[PDB]
């Protein structure tokens, strides 16, 4: 015979746009995530510099 489609017909294939949204790129959790790192970092930086400042007192 000849190259023919299957008797049922080939199943439908994906062609419509599929770029689904994901939570890893929504800005609201990203903004919350960035704020926490900055807040945590400044908490550690206040404690760090205050300690460093006390070390200069002892050294002097």
């Amino acid at each position: 015979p000849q190259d023919m489609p299957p008797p049922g017909g080939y199943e439908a294939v994906q062609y419509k746009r599929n770029l689904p949204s994901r939570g890893l790129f929504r800005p609201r959790p990203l903004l919350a995530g960035a704020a926490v790192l900055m807040l945590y970092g400044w908490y550690k930086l206040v404690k760090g510099i205050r300690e460093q400042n006390e070390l200069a007192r002892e050294k002097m």
């Binding site: 994906q14 746009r17 599929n18 994901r22």
Partner: protein
Amino acid sequence: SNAVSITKKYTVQSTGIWERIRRALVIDPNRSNGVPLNP
């Protein structure tokens, strides 16, 4: 939804621990990798 199942797309699939890793990390688990099946 727009996407067809990865289980119907004529491309090499992942298996075992690596398929669970793939479904947990990629942007869309239904997206194929474009590698054709040799059989």
